[PDB]
Write a protein that binds this ligand. Structure first.
Ligand SMILES: *C(=C)C1=C(C)C(=O)N/C1=C\c1[nH]c(/C=C2\N=C(C[C@H]3NC(=O)C(C=C)=C3C)C(C)=C2CCC(=O)O)c(CCC(=O)O)c1C
Ligand SMILES: *C(=C)C1=C(C)C(=O)N/C1=C\c1[nH]c(/C=C2\N=C(C[C@H]3NC(=O)C(C=C)=C3C)C(C)=C2CCC(=O)O)c(CCC(=O)O)c1C
Ligand SMILES: *C(=C)C1=C(C)[C@@H](Cc2[nH]c(/C=C3N=C(/C=C4\NC(=O)[C@H](C)[C@H]4[C@@H](*)C)C(C)=C\3CCC(=O)O)c(CCC(=O)O)c2C)NC1=O
Ligand SMILES: *C(=C)C1=C(C)[C@@H](Cc2[nH]c(/C=C3N=C(/C=C4\NC(=O)[C@H](C)[C@H]4[C@@H](*)C)C(C)=C\3CCC(=O)O)c(CCC(=O)O)c2C)NC1=O
Ligand SMILES: *[C@@H](C)[C@H]1/C(=C/C2=NC(=C\c3[nH]c(C[C@H]4NC(=O)C(C=C)=C4C)c(C)c3CCC(=O)O)/C(CCC(=O)O)=C2C)NC(=O)[C@@H]1C
Ligand SMILES: *[C@@H](C)[C@H]1/C(=C/C2=NC(=C\c3[nH]c(C[C@H]4NC(=O)C(C=C)=C4C)c(C)c3CCC(=O)O)/C(CCC(=O)O)=C2C)NC(=O)[C@@H]1C
Ligand SMILES: *[C@H](C)[C@H]1/C(=C/C2=NC(=C\c3[nH]c(C[C@H]4NC(=O)C(C=C)=C4C)c(C)c3CCC(=O)O)/C(CCC(=O)O)=C2C)NC(=O)[C@@H]1C
Ligand SMILES: *[C@H](C)[C@H]1/C(=C/C2=NC(=C\c3[nH]c(C[C@H]4NC(=O)C(C=C)=C4C)c(C)c3CCC(=O)O)/C(CCC(=O)O)=C2C)NC(=O)[C@@H]1C
Lengths: 72, 162, 60, 173
């Protein structure tokens, strides 16, 4: 059940082939380009700072404008 | 990927090779997840803004997004939902999404007074966003419509649930 | 002091929320406003972590 | 002058009604200019975030241990500076001139960044991206059902805001 915790899965995809920063977080070599790519997954509490919410209210309250995408 | 759902799981190298052998279209699946999650902030804020401009009273003194506490909580919820959907796309099924996210959520909103119609619109916007990023409407060009319909279905499960 | 102007544009033609914060114009200019304020610009650590998480996942 | 005291305490300033009508009579293309400002300021968060992100994806070493955006403190300061710059550019566009932009934001900024070791080329890319975003939003060529404004021609305003961004890049590099 939903446990009112706020926690959600935070996924990071690193397609970092050719990256000069060396892999060191995963521990199972395959000798292919898969060794330079990684999926990271954590369970983190999602929080939105009331400062952010205030700035978002400032962007939203015009009630007219938008991004490029989207119907009106 | 189940010990997470508090050490992070790191899946690369041979573990990633096997992961991609154990799921449908592993490479495309990870590109689709990458394109949603890397745009999650814009998706969350665009969906909440659209819900609000369509119904401005949500930030009037009588609306459920009025005050920073409520606006922040709402943005948080939209992000939580988007992240659980993204995990459902990563894992190729909706079990964690339905059980740990949706099971019991609608009654909670009913207790709090979170309006069903606004949530419906917000979710619909996040769906349109994710489908547009998966179908790209950085990667090799091709056809990702299957994964797009899959994530569409996970959003549709959210919509049905709440 | 890390302050910047914040501009809020209210094209509220047809809006039921009565003006109050602001001479009338006898026209739709009575339902629209431009607001400007000097506000300390600040960014939380969470936005920085989100921009970081998003930047790492699109670079190659 | 009602805006002068603003962009120099805490209490705001509110321009509506007859004052708004006359302000639009005193500045070039008042309605269009207000639309352009509204489209920049309502997307400010995505513009700043996307510009810093693009700066970083072109040169990842900026968030390497030795990069100038490394750690949350430095990243937050970089996003903050980008937002400051975009806000001053938006005020220059609202006013129709660069006086406040040059005097209270660009003055000494190059020497400050030189002393902090803030890299000129990364700053240049970030601002350049913010410029491209702002021009795209002013020249917005979207369908009417997906456009927030009456369809017309705003290439002049786009050129003007591009000039303000050019003043930024010329001053801080
Ligand atoms: C290439 C791109 C990079 C250049 C050039 C550069 O200067 N830095 C580059 C990348 C970079 N990576 C990190 C940190 C992380 N990278 C990963 C992902 C990879 N680790 C792996 O083992 C594999 C494959 C098996 C990867 C792909 C992870 C997990 C991290 C840690 C941070 C996180 O969010 O979990 C940085 C940040 C600074 C540092 O630690 O060097 C940078 C700049
Ligand atoms: C119409 C659209 C609205 C419906 C329907 C609804 O439920 N709420 C609507 C609008 C709304 N307005 C505010 C707050 C402010 N609006 C203004 C702008 C106007 N003030 C004026 O004097 C004029 C005319 C000259 C305007 C146009 C201002 C200044 C505020 C206060 C806050 C701010 O951002 O500075 C809200 C938010 C809550 C409230 O105060 O009602 C909403 C939802
Ligand atoms: C309120 C005035 C208001 C909005 C806010 C806006 C909300 C809205 N947005 C869409 C559709 C999309 N939004 C997307 C978001 C983004 N695209 C980007 O490039 C960045 C990274 C990100 C943040 C802005 C995307 C991708 C889509 C879908 C693509 C497309 O629509 O072509 C909708 C449409 C929802 C639907 O179709 O039901 C809406 C309502 N519109 C507003 O009116
Ligand atoms: C790094 C891998 C990387 C990026 C990040 C991305 C950065 C980038 N963005 C542009 C141009 C624009 N970005 C815009 C932003 C938005 N559109 C929306 O709908 C929302 C509200 C908002 C935030 C996401 C816009 C409008 C533009 C301009 C249109 C265009 O296509 O140019 C660029 C290009 C800048 C330039 O041309 O110099 C870049 C680099 N790209 C990356 O590679
Ligand atoms: C829909 C999602 C997209 C699209 C994606 C495609 N990706 C294709 C191949 C491909 N993608 C990756 C990266 C991926 N694998 C990983 O392990 C990780 C990170 C952990 C990621 C992000 C790879 C490695 C490959 C294989 C080719 C290569 O080596 O570059 C692909 C080709 C088809 C296929 O491989 O089945 C497609 C179509 N393309 C689109 O047009 C939409 C937008
Ligand atoms: C370039 C920025 C745009 C674009 C803009 C146009 N707007 C036009 C007319 C117009 N715009 C407004 C809103 C404006 N006036 C205000 O007082 C305020 C807020 C205080 C705002 C935001 C109004 C009221 C009008 C007049 C008509 C109407 O009532 O809708 C316009 C028409 C031509 C002209 O007025 O000279 C244009 C072209 N158009 C574009 O294509 C880009 C994206
Ligand atoms: C935003 C798009 C919505 C909206 C949301 C609000 N939710 C509020 C509180 C709240 N939300 C949850 C569910 C959340 N917690 C979790 O742990 C998970 C998943 C694991 C989820 C989805 C809970 C449990 C609560 C209450 C407790 C808490 O805040 O931690 C909320 C605040 C209500 C209030 O206190 O007035 C809001 C505003 N509101 C909207 O109007 C749109 C549609
Ligand atoms: C991000 C796009 C940059 C980057 C930026 C950094 N700036 C740092 C510090 C800093 N920035 C300013 C200027 C800012 N304050 C103002 O009042 C105004 C205009 C009115 C502006 C533009 C100041 C004064 C300072 C120093 C004091 C302070 O931190 O408030 C900074 C921190 C440096 C450090 O911690 O040593 C960074 C990282 N860095 C980048 O790599 C890109 C290009």
């Amino acid at each position: 059940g939903m446990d009112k915790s706020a926690k959600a899965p935070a996924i990071t995809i690193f397609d970092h082939r050719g990256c000069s920063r060396a892999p060191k977080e995963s521990s199972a070599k395959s000798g292919s380009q898969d060794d330079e790519m990684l999926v990271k997954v954590a369970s983190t509490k999602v929080t939105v700072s009331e400062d952010v919410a205030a700035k978002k209210l400032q962007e939203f309250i015009g009630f007219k404008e938008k991004g490029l995408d989207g119907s009106v | 990927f189940s010990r997470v759902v508090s050490k992070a799981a790191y899946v690369g190298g041979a573990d990633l090779q096997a992961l991609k052998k154990f799921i449908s279209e592993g490479n495309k699946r990870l590109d689709a997840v990458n394109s949603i999650v890397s745009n999650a902030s814009c998706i969350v804020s665009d969906a909440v803004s659209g819900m609000i401009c369509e119904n401005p009273s949500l930030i009037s003194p009588s609306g459920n997004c009025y005050t920073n506490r409520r606006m922040a909580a709402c943005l948080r919820d939209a992000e939580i939902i988007l992240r659980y959907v993204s995990y459902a796309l990563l894992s190729g099924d909706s079990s964690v999404l339905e059980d740990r996210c949706l099971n019991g959520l609608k009654e909670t909103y009913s207790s709090l007074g979170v309006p069903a119609n606004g949530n419906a619109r917000a979710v619909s916007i996040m769906k349109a966003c994710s489908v547009a990023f998966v179908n790209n409407t950085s990667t090799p060009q091709g056809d990702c419509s299957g994964l797009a319909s899959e994530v569409a279905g996970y959003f549709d499960k959210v919509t049905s649930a709440i | 002091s890390a302050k910047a102007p914040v501009i809020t544009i209210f094209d509220h033609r047809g809006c039921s929320r009565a003006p109050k914060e602001y001479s009338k114009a006898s026209g739709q200019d009575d339902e629209m406003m431009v607001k400007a304020q000097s506000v300390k610009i600040a960014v939380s650590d969470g936005v920085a972590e989100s921009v970081l998480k998003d930047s790492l996942s699109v670079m190659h």
